[PDB]
């Protein structure tokens, strides 16, 4: 389909406060998108996950959303 990273701008992937930004890797499922959807790299991928959970404890990034229509 498309690359998430290739829809945004220049963003520090360590500010666990920019929800709008981070949330875009969260999936309409609440699951930390796999590598082959976000289009990240090794290094990058892990610290992204870092500041993810870091912000999930701040009620900022949803843990899980029951799937929509089915």
């Amino acid at each position: 389909k498309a690359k998430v990273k290739a829809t945004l701008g220049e963003f520090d992937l360590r500010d666990y406060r920019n929800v709008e930004v981070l949330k875009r890797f969260l999936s309409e499922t609440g699951k930390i998108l796999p590598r082959r959807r976000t289009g990240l790299s090794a290094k990058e991928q892990r610290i992204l996950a870092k500041t993810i959970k870091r912000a999930r404890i701040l009620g900022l990034l949803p843990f899980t959303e029951k799937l929509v229509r089915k």
């Binding site: 899980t64 029951k66 799937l67 929509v68 229509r69 089915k70």
Partner: protein, 114 residues
């Protein structure tokens, strides 16, 4: 309990039965059906046709309660899964919106010997 408009049906699909419940927009069971509210016993209850009959039964009694518009939230993985919803189409009850909220742990309690 009272005759109301909106609502919400709950598909609990096991593997040796499947159950559901009509419940007011608050979350409290108005009516409910299963594989045994169908008569079929044992394994029969793991059946889609049993599920059709379940949903039909469930929703059926809702329409006797003035029920019309109902949301949907299902859990499990029973052979009557989708079927418990597709019966809820030819039910006359507006499937206002269907949703899946099957329980799934971040992995914690160690599982039975299977």
């Amino acid at each position: 309990k009272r005759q109301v408009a909106s609502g919400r049906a709950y598909i609990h699909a096991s593997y040796n039965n499947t159950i559901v419940t009509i419940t007011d927009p608050d979350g409290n069971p108005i009516t409910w059906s299963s594989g045994g509210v169908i008569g079929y016993k044992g394994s029969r209850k793991g059946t889609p046709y049993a599920a059709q009959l379940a949903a039909l039964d469930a929703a059926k009694k809702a329409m006797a309660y003035g029920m019309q518009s109902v949301d949907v939230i299902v859990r499990g993985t029973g052979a009557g899964r989708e079927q418990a919803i597709r019966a809820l189409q030819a039910s006359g009850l507006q499937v206002k919106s269907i949703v899946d909220d099957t329980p799934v742990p971040h992995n914690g309690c160690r599982p039975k010997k299977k």
